[PDB]
Design a protein around this ligand. Structure first.
Ligand code: NA
Ligand code: NA
Lengths: 77, 77
């Protein structure tokens, strides 16, 4: 799981990487400095992702709420 | 659009009613006192809704973030 302090301690490296919160939500951190939220989802054997916005404009708390909304929608079905 | 003050000023009446924020999000207020968030959505001519949680456990700000996540998911397609 993430905390804001854990996120802020992260630094861009020489390769993109993801840090997971839970339930499909992750932050993608790129070498150029981008930090962007994504939610991954799987439907009939195919996995895709949707962008939820840049951090810190979208906070960890915000991203989590977006995830909770999306999970309720994905529940169908 | 809603504000928390506008919501708190609402009172249960003798009939259920909805107050809209925007973009499908509304609060359903029932005579027995329930205040619950829903998001309505329309796909190929059919409209349904999903519950997003009880107010005030789910704040207006939270409901809005849930809506923003869901709208990104509905965008497909
Ligand atoms: Na990186
Ligand atoms: Na009412």
């Amino acid at each position: 799981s993430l905390t804001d302090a854990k996120i802020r301690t992260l630094k861009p490296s020489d390769k993109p990487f993801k840090v997971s919160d839970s339930h499909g939500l992750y932050l993608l951190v790129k070498p150029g400095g981008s930090r962007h939220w994504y939610l991954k989802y799987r439907i009939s054997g195919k996995e895709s992702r949707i962008a939820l916005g840049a951090y810190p404009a979208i906070s960890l708390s915000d991203a989590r709420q977006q995830r909770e909304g999306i999970r309720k929608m994905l529940a169908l079905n």
